[PDB]
């Protein structure tokens, strides 16, 4: 069973695109391959949300129990981190967590790099472009969510500290004198790192998928599959809690 690639070759890794590709042309903004997946994740989230909240049973059960458990676990983590800002940032943090989690889980579906439209289709004149590209596999999505988080945390820091946060200290004129610009650039550059890692983890996961399918698509890729299914979940949660902790250190 080791040499199944000789009988069935997966073909060369024809996917290498590191940017969003317009899957469908539109009169306005063309429909990119990642934005449609983002909308799919959005509607799936809305569907499960209304399904768990259609009855709103007092006693949690089934899917309602699952979502209640997840939400209370996250809420407990947040109250452990910060006290007076749990509900303030809870919605945005939880949304950006679960959305990218479901995007990562969607990234492993069959045909996410194989099924697609033509500009099997390589034989056709139109170039075989893939469908089901993750939103995190779009840099623009990562940039947007990172800057949204950054503007949220700086707005709330300004609300908390007034002109104190507005100047973020940096008035020591002593040991912390040259430091004020150091944390200034540090919090300037961190959301870039967040967006970059959001892109990179998913991009690496999918290229790993492609390369391990190319080498041996039988009994080899499975531990790696476990690797990305674990890393997507843990990375999504650490992004969420990192945003929360960034807010908690911005207020303080």
């Amino acid at each position: 069973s080791i040499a199944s690639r000789f009988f069935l070759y997966t073909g060369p890794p024809h996917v290498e695109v590191a940017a969003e590709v317009i899957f469908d042309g539109i009169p306005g903004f063309p429909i990119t391959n990642s934005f449609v997946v983002a909308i799919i994740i959005d509607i799936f989230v809305i569907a499960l949300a209304v399904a768990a909240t259609r009855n709103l049973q007092m006693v949690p059960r089934g899917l309602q129990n699952v979502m209640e458990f997840i939400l209370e676990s996250l809420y407990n983590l947040f109250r452990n981190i910060n006290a007076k800002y749990v509900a303030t940032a809870f919605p945005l943090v939880a949304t950006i967590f679960l959305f990218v989690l479901f995007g990562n889980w969607f990234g492993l579906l069959p045909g996410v790099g194989s099924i697609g439209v033509c500009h099997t289709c390589a034989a056709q004149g139109k170039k075989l472009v893939p469908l089901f590209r993750a939103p995190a596999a779009d840099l623009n999505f990562t940039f947007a969510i990172a800057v949204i988080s950054f503007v949220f945390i700086e707005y709330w820091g300004f609300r908390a500290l007034g002109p104190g946060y507005l100047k973020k200290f940096f008035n020591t004129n002593g040991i912390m004198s040259f430091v004020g610009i150091i944390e200034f650039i540090s919090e300037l550059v961190k959301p870039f790192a967040l967006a970059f890692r959001l892109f990179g983890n998913i991009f690496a996961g999918e290229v790993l998928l492609v390369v391990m399918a190319f080498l041996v698509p039988l009994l080899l890729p499975l531990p790696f599959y476990g690797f990305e299914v674990f890393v997507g979940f843990i990375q999504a949660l650490i992004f969420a809690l990192l945003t929360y902790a960034f807010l908690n250190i911005a207020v303080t």
Binding site: A18, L77, K190, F196, I238, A245
Partner: protein
Amino acid sequence: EGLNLVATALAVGLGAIGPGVGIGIIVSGAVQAIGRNPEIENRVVTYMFIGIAFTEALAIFGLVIAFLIGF
């Protein structure tokens, strides 16, 4: 010439050695802390999370510079 490929290779290699022992001793210190005491687990786990986040931040900094060089 392939010189850009060598650039990307060096960039990713040094970006990988960047946080290795870093995150290793992060979780090592965290596990010593939790073994000594699990009552303050939340406060310390938050800080080890932010530290490992910073390490991964630098690693992906190197990685995306490698990508920009490659394209």
